[PDB]
Amino acid sequence: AALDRGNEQLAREALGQRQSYQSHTEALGKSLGEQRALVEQVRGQLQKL
Amino acid sequence: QEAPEDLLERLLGEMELELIELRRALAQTIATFKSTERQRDAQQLIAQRWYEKAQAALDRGNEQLAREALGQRQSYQSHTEALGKSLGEQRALVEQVRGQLQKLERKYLELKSQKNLYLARLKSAIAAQKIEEIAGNLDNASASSLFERIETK
Amino acid sequence: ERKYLELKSQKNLYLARLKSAIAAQKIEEIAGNLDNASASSLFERIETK
Amino acid sequence: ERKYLELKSQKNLYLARLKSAIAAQKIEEIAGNLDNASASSLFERIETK
Amino acid sequence: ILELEAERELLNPPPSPLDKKFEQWEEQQAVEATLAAMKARRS
Amino acid sequence: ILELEAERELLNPPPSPLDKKFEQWEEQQAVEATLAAMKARRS
Numbered sequence: 001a002a003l004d005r006g007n008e009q010l011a012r013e014a015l016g017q018r019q020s021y022q023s024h025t026e027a028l029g030k031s032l033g034e035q036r037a038l039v040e041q042v043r044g045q046l047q048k049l
Numbered sequence: 050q051e052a053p054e055d056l057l058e059r060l061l062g063e064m065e066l067e068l069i070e071l072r073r074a075l076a077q078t079i080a081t082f083k084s085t086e087r088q089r090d091a092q093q094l095i096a097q098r099w100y101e102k103a104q105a106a107l108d109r110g111n112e113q114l115a116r117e118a119l120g121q122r123q124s125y126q127s128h129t130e131a132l133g134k135s136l137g138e139q140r141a142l143v144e145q146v147r148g149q150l151q152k153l154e155r156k157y158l159e160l161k162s163q164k165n166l167y168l169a170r171l172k173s174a175i176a177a178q179k180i181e182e183i184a185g186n187l188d189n190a191s192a193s194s195l196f197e198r199i200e201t202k
Numbered sequence: 203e204r205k206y207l208e209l210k211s212q213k214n215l216y217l218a219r220l221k222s223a224i225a226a227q228k229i230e231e232i233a234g235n236l237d238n239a240s241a242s243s244l245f246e247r248i249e250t251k
Numbered sequence: 252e253r254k255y256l257e258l259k260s261q262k263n264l265y266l267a268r269l270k271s272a273i274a275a276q277k278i279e280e281i282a283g284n285l286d287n288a289s290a291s292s293l294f295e296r297i298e299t300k
Numbered sequence: 301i302l303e304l305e306a307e308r309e310l311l312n313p314p315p316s317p318l319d320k321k322f323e324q325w326e327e328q329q330a331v332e333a334t335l336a337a338m339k340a341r342r343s
Numbered sequence: 344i345l346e347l348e349a350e351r352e353l354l355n356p357p358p359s360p361l362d363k364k365f366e367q368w369e370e371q372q373a374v375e376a377t378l379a380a381m382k383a384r385r386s
């Protein structure tokens with residue numbers, strides 16, 4: 001609704017602003033991906049032991 | 050040298066202690082930056098008083114008296130100009146400092162969030178090695194497995 | 203006396219910058235970059251262990 | 252004597268401001284912000300527990 | 301005094317001016333839209 | 344001061360200007376593509 005009044009200029013800042021946040025989300029998503037499959041391997045060793 | 054894991058805990062503790070010291074120091078910089086700016090406004094206010102006084106100085110036709118006032122206020126104006134330039138460089142300097150501190154704090158967490166994960170893996174494998182050597186495999190038949198040593202007994 | 207103050211008003215500013223950079227150097231060397239793969243980063247030294 | 256009063260009439264005012272800000276600093280550090288997720292906020296430390 | 305106030309603001313980043321702009325920028329429509337409907341809802 | 348800052352940058356090679364060019368060069372399409380779809384998705 002930023003430009004719902006025709007204020008296109010204001011909406012420019014918002015979309016530019018949210019990109020910085022998106023960078024953190026992508027970085028964390030990759031970080032969890034390796035951790036997720038790492039612990040699962042650990043649990044197998046403990047259970048077998 | 051010590052165990053690599055032990056250093057990790059000690060190293061971060063020193064790192065965290067240092068960061069707050071940086072945080073405290075930066076605040077003192079802001080105080081002077083604000084203090085001088087408040088000090089700067091005081092001088093120009095005094096110059097305004099002379100200028101305001103000079104407005105009615107010659108209102109009686111006393112042009113000679115107004116000469117001293119305008120000449121007097123120039124000295125004050127010199128200090129105002131000198132301070133204005135001094136703050137200009139300071140203003141853009143601290144702002145750069147704040148960026149380093151903020152980035153460092155963000156980078157700080159990404160290390161600690163992983164340190165606990167590595168220790169868990171280290172404790173898992175080290176224990177696994179301890180368990181396996183005590184496996185006491187029956188097939189050894191050489192006393193390496195304590196069970197077969199018992200069987201020989 | 204007027205010249206005296208102009209020095210003190212700056213001394214605190216320099217110390218803050220000095221404390222900022224010195225700490226920054228201390229932090230960076232402990233970066234523990236994963237890419238080193240040479241034990242220079244204590245993390246990769248752990249991984250080798 | 253006239254100059255004496257002008258000081259005392261302000262001393263109480265400064266102390267009040269000092270007590271206001273010092274307390275404010277004490278409160279804020281105990282803010283326990285939920286977003287920290289680092290145990291700096293005692294609440295998130297509890298959540299980890 | 302200024303030393304302490306400096307620490308609090310840094311440790312608790314206050315809202316950016318852009319965020320301030322949005323907050324007030326939003327309220328005008330809310331009051332005007334309610335006021336626009338005020339005349340309409342009443343008449 | 345400059346002595347210390349010099350050591351950090353060398354020990355941690357900062358991004359090359361070409362890498363900087365790509366990073367910003369990428370964002371313009373992302374915001375424009377989102378903005379291009381902003382008008383389209385809304386209308």
Ligand SMILES: Nc1ncnc2c1ncn2[C@@H]1O[C@H](COP(=O)(O)OP(=O)(O)O)[C@@H](O)[C@H]1O
Pocket residue numbers: 186188189190191192193194
């Ligand atoms: N498939 C197998 N898996 C594990 N151990 C075996 C297997 N076949 C034979 N062995 C045993 O492994 C042992 C290795 O010898 P030795 O050096 O005495 O034990 P260690 O490896 O504990 O030093 C042999 O004594 C043998 O009995």
Ligand SMILES: Nc1ncnc2c1ncn2[C@@H]1O[C@H](COP(=O)(O)OP(=O)(O)O)[C@@H](O)[C@H]1O
Pocket residue numbers: 235237238239240241242243354355356
């Ligand atoms: N783009 C990069 N940024 C930072 N480090 C990198 C990059 N690419 C490779 N490296 C790592 O930097 C390390 C420098 O080697 P080394 O001398 O062992 O570390 P140090 O610089 O701590 O002495 C290499 O081992 C390599 O793995």
Ligand SMILES: Nc1ncnc2c1ncn2[C@@H]1O[C@H](COP(=O)(O)OP(=O)(O)O)[C@@H](O)[C@H]1O
Pocket residue numbers: 154158284286287288289290291292311312313
């Ligand atoms: N908009 C925000 N306002 C306040 N805190 C935030 C915001 N976004 C993230 N944070 C949190 O601020 C914390 C600062 O990290 P940390 O150094 O652990 O806390 P502290 O500042 O108490 O030392 C981060 O852990 C993060 O979760």
